Amino acid sequence: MKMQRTIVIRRDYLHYIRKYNRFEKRHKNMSVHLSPCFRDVQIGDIVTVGECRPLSKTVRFNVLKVTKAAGTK
Amino acid sequence: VRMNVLADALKSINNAEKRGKRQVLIRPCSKVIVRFLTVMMKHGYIGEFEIIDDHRAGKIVVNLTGRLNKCGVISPRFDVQLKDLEKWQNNLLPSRQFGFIVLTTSAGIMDHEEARRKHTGGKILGFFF
Amino acid sequence: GRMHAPGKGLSQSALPYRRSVPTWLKLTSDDVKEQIYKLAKKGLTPSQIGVILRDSHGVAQVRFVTGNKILRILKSKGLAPDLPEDLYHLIKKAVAVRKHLERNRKDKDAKFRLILIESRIHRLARYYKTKRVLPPNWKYESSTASALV
Amino acid sequence: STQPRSKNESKEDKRARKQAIKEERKERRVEKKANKLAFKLEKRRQEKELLNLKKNVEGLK
Amino acid sequence: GKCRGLRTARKLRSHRRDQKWHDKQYKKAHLGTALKANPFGGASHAKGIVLEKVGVEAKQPNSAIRKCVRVQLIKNGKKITAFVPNDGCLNFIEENDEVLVAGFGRKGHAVGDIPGVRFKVVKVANVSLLALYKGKKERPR
RNA sequence: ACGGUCGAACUUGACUAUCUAGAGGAAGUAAAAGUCGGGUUUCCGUAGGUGAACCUGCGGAAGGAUCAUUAACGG
RNA sequence: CAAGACGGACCAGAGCGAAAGCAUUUGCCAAGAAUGUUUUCAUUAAUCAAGAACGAAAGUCGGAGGUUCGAAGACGAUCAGAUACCGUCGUAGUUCCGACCAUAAACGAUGCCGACCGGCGAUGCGGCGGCGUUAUUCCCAUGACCCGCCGGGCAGCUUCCGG
RNA sequence: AAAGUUGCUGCAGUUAAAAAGCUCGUAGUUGGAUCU
RNA sequence: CGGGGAAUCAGGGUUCGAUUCCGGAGAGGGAGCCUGAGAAACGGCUACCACAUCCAAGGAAGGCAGCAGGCGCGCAAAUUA
């Protein structure tokens, strides 16, 4: 969370390789707009976002609701 | 270190079955090992076994009958769909007459014939013949 | 098999199957708690408290009698130390070895054992930060090592 | 200098002899490195010539 | 031992391709250096102009003289040596003649008794060596 | 016609890369039968001795063919 | 008398160390395995690209010192052709201090962690159980032996487990 | 395709080609029971 | 050029897919346009760059990776019906 009113989230997933019948861990980074109503957001908490029209060159989604990290109160 | 205790249990019982012994002590005991031994017992491959209960992970003493040729575990626990089970039983089993790929589904730990009967797919654990 | 040594030791404790309190022990849970409290006010680590209770008072296992372990009793009352036991011991060992190294520059064995000690310290620090026992911004420093102990 | 040292030599003479031997050794190593690189270059070009002989200008007519 | 996890796919495929590079056939096929050093440039047959006739001595345990022909290829300009197969077929080749040349069969390797020759003559002046040898056709000049 | 925008391309130096003529230098090949003429068991890493081999100094290996003796020791 | 060097015999298939390696006496300093625990924490773990410490000998820089040995080198012997062997002397080096290099047949020519499958009695450390001999019969425990057992090791022997 | 001579299925590393001089260590990979 | 797909193959796999279907790109190289619902179109225009045709020496007209065909290229590929 270092842009003005925009954050970077990551999506982790497993990609299947059929020759070895196995998986590999891959990730993709997404720049999503964060509305100022969601304040006190920490690094490493779950967010659910929804697709929208292009807001900037890279920003395409919009933060819908945030759930806090597992360990923190 | 010790990983996948079912592999240790199956290797121990296979080593003692090859040696011609009558009883095997396997430790530690887990529920999946108990279910695997129950699956082998219902087909009459091993016989009666006792779960010695420590307040730790327990132990098992199994009785051996010479009906077991090879008992084996498949690691890692691959995702076996129902369409792909024929390739698995062509690779691991010695014949179409006998041998068992033990596999765990949401209906429980069962054989490949029971998985065919109940139309469910699961993750592979073993084979014995 | 030790994690920094090639030795494979087997020496450890072996509890019996009986978790019940022995009949000859005429000590209630609150009296054992009060003994733990006064040993803590004297100033001891929980392991030393357990050793004193086993050797002198005949209390074999405190969590079999009281139902709670020593550090949880101290934390619930409020007498547990800030940094944990083994982390403090390892940091103190690192401080002593570092002081020996500033005395003696040519001690290569001391340098290697110091590297092993700091590896243990970093492993324990990572474990305690994962469990939220230590703050995330906590860091061990070579310069700031003796002040914490 | 192939001079056997005696017990009576002191500093500014033994030191000069030692540094003269060190300078001689340094020049000797430079010379040996030059000889090694020259031999490698000449062997490489002669191998190229032998390969050109293998490919063409070999026969009867 | 091999890593037999469930998330170890990229390690296995990276190791497989890195050790694939250590094969001889794969490296000769895929590095793109033997393709550029091949005089034919990955072609079945080439067409050249005869420069000279050469008598190449046979490799030692067999004592004979093989009648080869040194040609210069048209499409790239390389000089190669082609063995004229049958007896008396060398007299059909003349200097400054157009020849169709193919390999021997070992794909870039010197074959049998002839040292340093990868190729053999197929056609001389737009008729084959076999038809001239059997007296089936006449060659122009 | 002024100005602006998009803008092919032109000219000048630098980094290159390619095509293509070359005086000369060093070679080799075919043609001259032309002229003169004993030591080491097998090694490894470094350093020296004319580059390499090889030998030696130092430190390492066996990947080198164990015969004979060995119960008292108290006063 | 002095100078630098080296710690023989005891020294073993014995011990310690991650390895390279480590052998006079005493004192100090900080570590370490193992064993014993009915102590404490409660998964904190295993292998590990990147990265980091150590790393025989030989070698290179700056200082000191040079007893022995000693490559190079100098002579002396020896020969159809000897220019390697041999003998005497001897430079760098071999020694110490502080910087470099990261190489060995750096070997078990055998990755590390964990499980199971025959046997035996010797040894090192620790612990347990003991009739007895010993410290000139020791007044009690304690050290040395003797007999078994358990745990971790350096090894050996035996076996048609199987490869 | 033969090629189980690229091996996930499914190879090898005492002597035939091969295990890093040794240890730590982030990323990666794998991770003991136990809750009808 | 990418897919559908093709060859081989117990099972896994390996290799190819310029090519008649779909989508993309380009009309010798870039660039700018007019008209039109739709083009940065080239069997439309305007340039510069590279080749090139008719010449009366002032000027004009160019774009077959469309169908046949020709040259060249090559080991390699058809009728100006």
Side-chain angles (χ1 to χ4, degrees):
Chain A
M1 321 175 58
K2 270 162 192 292
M3 290 158 265
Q4 191 165 20
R5 214 174 264 156
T6 309
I7 63 172
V8 172
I9 69 154
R10 74 183 285 168
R11 311 177 78 259
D12 273 298
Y13 53 96
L14 277 296
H15 178 245
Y16 178 70
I17 310 297
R18 185 175 179 266
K19 181 184 177 186
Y20 302 103
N21 296 114
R22 282 171 170 87
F23 292 87
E24 77 183 29
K25 192 52 144 178
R26 294 179 67 188
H27 84 283
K28 274 181 176 177
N29 277 288
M30 182 189 298
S31 304
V32 57
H33 188 271
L34 178 86
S35 182
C37 67
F38 306 106
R39 44 171 161 201
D40 213 8
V41 181
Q42 267 56 79
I43 304 298
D45 54 353
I46 308 300
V47 63
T48 62
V49 303
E51 199 205 325
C52 183
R53 55 151 206 261
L55 299 161
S56 73
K57 175 175 169 59
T58 63
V59 169
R60 218 85 65 193
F61 282 66
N62 206 350
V63 161
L64 291 186
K65 61 101 174 179
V66 55
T67 62
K68 279 279 173 183
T72 185
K73 57 174 184 177
Chain B
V1 297
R2 178 190 259 101
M3 291 146 187
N4 191 275
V5 296
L6 178 56
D8 291 331
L10 294 199
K11 185 68 73 175
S12 198
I13 65 163
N14 177 34
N15 277 260
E17 187 56 68
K18 188 184 294 183
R19 207 56 179 95
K21 295 172 147 205
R22 284 181 51 280
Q23 281 185 310
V24 186
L25 169 80
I26 62 170
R27 58 91 175 173
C29 166
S30 63
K31 47 164 90 188
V32 288
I33 297 176
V34 170
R35 299 265 170 72
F36 201 105
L37 292 170
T38 303
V39 165
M40 292 199 299
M41 197 192 42
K42 287 186 181 286
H43 293 267
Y45 268 89
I46 52 168
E48 301 215 300
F49 56 95
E50 289 259 352
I51 304 155
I52 295 152
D53 189 359
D54 303 358
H55 273 318
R56 281 73 173 175
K59 309 183 186 192
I60 306 168
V61 170
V62 311
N63 303 293
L64 290 183
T65 300
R67 298 185 181 168
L68 190 70
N69 293 292
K70 181 84 201 298
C71 192
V73 59
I74 295 288
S75 190
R77 295 179 182 181
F78 286 111
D79 291 331
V80 182
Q81 275 143 8
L82 185 63
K83 52 179 188 177
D84 304 304
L85 194 150
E86 182 66 28
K87 285 178 206 163
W88 275 109
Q89 62 166 351
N90 184 65
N91 286 320
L92 302 178
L93 304 185
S95 179
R96 328 200 77 253
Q97 317 285 320
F98 60 98
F100 293 104
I101 289 170
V102 177
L103 61 83
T104 174
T105 61
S106 57
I109 287 163
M110 64 184 73
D111 275 336
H112 69 276
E113 312 195 310
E114 204 176 315
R116 285 300 201 181
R117 272 213 311 107
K118 286 179 184 179
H119 208 70
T120 187
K123 295 184 185 197
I124 181 169
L125 290 188
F127 59 97
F128 52 93
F129 50 88
Chain C
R2 314 267 75 76
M3 154 206 84
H4 281 326
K8 323 195 158 72
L10 193 55
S11 287
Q12 44 194 345
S13 295
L15 310 171
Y17 183 80
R18 308 215 214 188
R19 295 179 189 155
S20 54
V21 65
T23 61
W24 47 267
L25 183 63
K26 275 75 176 175
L27 283 168
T28 62
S29 297
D30 54 352
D31 291 331
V32 176
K33 275 181 175 167
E34 182 65 26
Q35 193 70 47
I36 294 156
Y37 296 148
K38 67 188 292 295
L39 282 162
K41 303 292 169 80
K42 185 182 315 306
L44 277 297
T45 53
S47 176
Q48 284 155 11
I49 296 183
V51 169
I52 297 169
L53 284 163
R54 169 173 45 85
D55 292 352
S56 303
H57 299 104
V59 179
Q61 279 273 339
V62 177
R63 46 175 288 260
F64 288 170
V65 178
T66 313
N68 200 24
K69 49 177 64 66
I70 303 279
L71 196 143
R72 285 175 182 165
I73 299 156
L74 299 187
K75 232 162 197 185
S76 65
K77 180 54 73 75
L79 276 297
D82 265 355
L83 82 172
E85 211 176 340
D86 44 359
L87 182 65
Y88 161 83
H89 274 287
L90 269 171
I91 287 158
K92 193 183 76 184
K93 193 163 276 195
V95 163
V97 176
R98 263 203 198 287
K99 184 152 191 253
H100 173 69
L101 259 189
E102 318 296 300
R103 283 192 199 101
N104 297 122
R105 294 180 310 76
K106 209 192 287 185
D107 220 347
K108 313 275 193 180
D109 189 359
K111 189 191 284 176
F112 184 79
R113 295 306 195 280
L114 171 69
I115 297 169
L116 302 175
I117 288 155
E118 311 286 10
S119 299
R120 284 177 284 179
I121 286 159
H122 283 307
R123 285 187 174 214
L124 270 179
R126 190 160 63 245
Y127 161 67
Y128 281 130
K129 287 175 208 171
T130 299
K131 281 310 171 153
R132 295 185 54 100
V133 185
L134 288 172
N137 60 295
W138 191 94
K139 280 181 71 180
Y140 173 80
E141 293 83 4
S142 297
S143 297
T144 308
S146 56
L148 156 64
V149 166
Chain D
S1 59
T2 71
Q3 279 188 299
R5 63 176 175 85
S6 302
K7 297 102 184 178
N8 73 27
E9 276 84 7
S10 159
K11 290 166 197 73
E12 193 93 356
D13 186 74
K14 185 210 272 167
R15 194 201 291 310
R17 183 180 63 83
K18 288 275 208 74
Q19 65 182 357
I21 298 298
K22 291 181 181 179
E23 292 177 352
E24 181 180 1
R25 272 166 151 270
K26 187 176 180 180
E27 302 285 270
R28 191 59 199 80
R29 265 88 58 83
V30 162
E31 161 169 338
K32 196 189 176 160
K33 196 77 192 280
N35 277 323
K36 295 189 84 43
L37 68 93
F39 261 83
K40 284 183 231 273
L41 183 62
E42 208 273 334
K43 190 193 172 64
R44 265 162 56 208
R45 67 173 299 280
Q46 270 204 34
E47 271 301 358
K48 290 193 289 183
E49 188 50 43
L50 182 59
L51 271 193
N52 175 59
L53 288 169
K54 273 185 168 181
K55 195 130 162 192
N56 57 28
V57 65
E58 202 175 308
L60 267 181
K61 282 159 273 303
Chain E
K2 262 182 300 188
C3 46
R4 275 193 314 248
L6 202 70
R7 301 181 181 204
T8 176
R10 85 167 79 247
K11 174 81 171 65
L12 286 164
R13 62 204 291 262
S14 300
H15 187 255
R16 183 48 60 222
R17 78 167 162 256
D18 291 25
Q19 295 302 310
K20 225 189 273 190
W21 273 116
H22 272 90
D23 213 329
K24 209 167 185 163
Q25 330 287 319
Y26 183 84
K27 209 166 194 187
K28 207 164 199 193
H30 285 262
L31 195 39
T33 49
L35 192 139
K36 293 180 181 179
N38 196 216
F40 276 18
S44 303
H45 293 61
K47 186 162 318 172
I49 282 176
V50 176
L51 300 166
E52 201 56 279
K53 296 182 192 181
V54 190
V56 179
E57 305 268 358
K59 267 179 183 279
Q60 183 66 41
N62 286 175
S63 175
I65 295 90
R66 296 291 185 269
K67 316 292 187 297
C68 299
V69 161
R70 191 164 278 136
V71 289
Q72 193 201 293
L73 299 184
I74 291 168
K75 65 189 177 219
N76 44 7
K78 312 305 198 38
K79 286 191 184 195
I80 56 166
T81 316
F83 167 65
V84 183
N86 291 303
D87 52 348
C89 280
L90 190 79
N91 302 321
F92 295 112
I93 294 91
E94 204 43 55
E95 282 84 2
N96 304 103
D97 283 15
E98 193 97 349
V99 285
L100 186 73
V101 186
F104 273 124
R106 288 186 65 176
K107 284 83 188 170
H109 198 296
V111 174
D113 208 3
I114 310 101
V117 167
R118 324 291 201 271
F119 306 110
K120 63 180 193 183
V121 186
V122 173
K123 281 169 85 200
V124 184
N126 277 264
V127 297
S128 62
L129 266 179
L130 194 146
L132 295 164
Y133 185 77
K134 287 180 179 176
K136 308 193 160 251
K137 289 184 180 181
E138 282 268 42
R139 51 170 312 272
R141 59 194 325 280

